[PDB]
């Protein structure tokens, strides 16, 4: 499992042409903000490949 390379699986905003986003804010899947506890409808924005 290659841990150095990652990618963004899901995001709440559509990235415009030639626009990057290095922020790792926890995405909220339409619920109360979980303050980043990775529980109810809140997951990490990035995802590791292999």
């Amino acid at each position, epitope marked *: 499992g290659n841990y150095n390379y990652l990618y963004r699986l899901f995001r709440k905003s559509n990235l415009k042409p030639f626009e990057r986003d290095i922020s790792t804010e926890i995405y909220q899947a339409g*619920s*109360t903000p*979980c303050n980043g*506890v*990775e*529980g*109810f*409808n809140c997951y990490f924005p990035l995802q590791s490949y292999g």
Partner: antibody
Amino acid sequence: EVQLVQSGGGLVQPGGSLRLSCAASGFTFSSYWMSWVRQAPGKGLEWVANINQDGGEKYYVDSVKGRFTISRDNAKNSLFLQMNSVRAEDTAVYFCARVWYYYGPRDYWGQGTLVTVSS
Amino acid sequence: IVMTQPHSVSESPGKTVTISCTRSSGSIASNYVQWYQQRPGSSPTTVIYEDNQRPSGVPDRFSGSIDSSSNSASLTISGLKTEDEADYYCQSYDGSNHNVVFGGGTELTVLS
């Protein structure tokens, strides 16, 4: 019908050890789980420990792991709880309640004993 | 894991007040969500169990339900009166380390 009473509280300085006792009368003391519940003055309920039927399997929460020793006795149908190395945050009202089944709620509670740690 | 619960909420006597016990990092369909009731200066007692069955000795007012759309529970208390002024709690076997987490504790008052 079931009667659950406890006594033996008080208050001492940190570093010592205390022990509570809860009897049982009105049900078979062989097929019912036991679990202690504490309630600090002004704070909500919490969980302390849970013992198996015979007394083999024991589980405690991380905050009270090690410093608490729960052990029941089916001979005289009694329950004991000796907690050494007490501290300030251990001040609460410890209840002894019988559990209907493991994956369920508690049926009958105790009466309450104010146990504070200050001398 | 923490059972989120409001500190205090009430309404005028005669309406229907509900209490939420939303969990933190546990599936709502894991185990049963129960509710308790503690009077000031006494020991708590069980008011509901299995989120759908009512113990013998409770009037036909407390009605529990389950809302899987937000992983939370509720309790429809119909006919709010003076005897409902108590402290309710919650319970659910939510954890892979054999630990029970209780609710926060709502201080239901009489807004008369």
